[PDB]
Design a protein around this ligand. Structure first.
Ligand code: HEM
Ligand code: HEM
Lengths: 145, 145
């Protein structure tokens, strides 16, 4: 359950999420687009869910993809800001899940974002310990789908 | 259209938006809920769009309403952060409008949020000058609906 998954965010996990976000979240447009382009490159099967975005290979030059990418980063910002209060983190995660559930995005499908995040982190010199921390946060969302 | 509305965001308007957000955005949960409960109190008919939230009379204590309220504030955070680049502001505003268009929320209906925002600003001692600035930001979104 989402309530049990949120309890998995231990002290050190929260600290690593914050320290890495301080860097990653500093360039929401660049890192957001990088995450999406990587998702579409490593998992082409997901492109179907984003038909409204148009030609996703244009990257930064595609206004719709750019708008979506920047916006995606503010959801992560939201999650990070709620780490201090589990009750708030949970209500924000379930709120976030509503539209993804409507789109029939499964926990397994959502988990495909882990790869892209790990690569963005690595490009900023954040290794496996950080990727694992982020996978735990993604797991809270997966529990709500 | 959205670009033209964005043109009404002059240097002084952006300055007042940023200065007031520095305060309003510092308590997203508190001010987000205040805005929503004020919307429901002054325009009860808008509750028709929020059946999923349940008993909105519970206010802050309602987890779904609290989740939505906090999340609403990150959309404004996004807008404020993109003020210095019209190209990014416009793509984020058009991205934001998509789900609201699907919900059949007209520009006139969306405009009902102006009163609640004006009241939230006044609670922090930000007068008409600031309320007018925010109405102009809301107008940019209205142009996309
Ligand atoms: C870290 C992971 C992710 C974050 C933070 C995220 C964030 C968001 C946000 C904030 C929105 C806009 C609000 C909404 O409509 O719900 C959105 C839209 C969307 N998301 Fe997610 N998302 C993530 C991963 C995914 C994945 C893995 C998929 C599909 C495999 C997905 C598919 C969608 C779709 C199709 C839209 C609508 C795109 C459009 O037409 O503009 N998301 N997401
Ligand atoms: C400055 C004003 C507003 C902001 C920043 C805002 C922000 C948001 C955000 C970020 C979401 C979540 C993503 C999505 O599903 O689109 C959302 C959802 C929603 N918004 Fe807006 N919104 C605003 C005003 C309004 C107004 C005035 C209405 C209707 C009178 C409205 C009705 C909705 C509804 C029904 C949802 C889904 C609620 C749920 O079931 O969780 N919004 N809005």
């Amino acid at each position: 359950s989402v309530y049990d998954a949120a309890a998995q965010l231990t002290a050190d996990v929260k600290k690593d999420l914050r320290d890495s976000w301080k860097v990653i979240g500093s360039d929401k447009k660049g890192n957001g687009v990088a995450a999406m382009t990587t998702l579409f490159a490593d998992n082409q099967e997901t492109i179907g869910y984003f038909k409204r975005l148009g030609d996703v290979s244009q990257g930064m030059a595609n206004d719709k993809l750019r708008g979506h990418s920047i916006t995606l980063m503010y959801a992560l910002q939201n999650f990070i800001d709620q780490l201090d209060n589990p009750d708030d983190l949970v209500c924000v995660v379930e709120k976030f899940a509503v539209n993804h559930i409507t789109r029939k995005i499964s926990a397994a499908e959502f988990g495909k974002i882990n790869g892209p995040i790990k690569k963005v982190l690595a490009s900023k010199n954040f290794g496996d310990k950080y990727a694992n921390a982020w996978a735990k946060l993604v797991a809270v969302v997966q529990a709500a789908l």
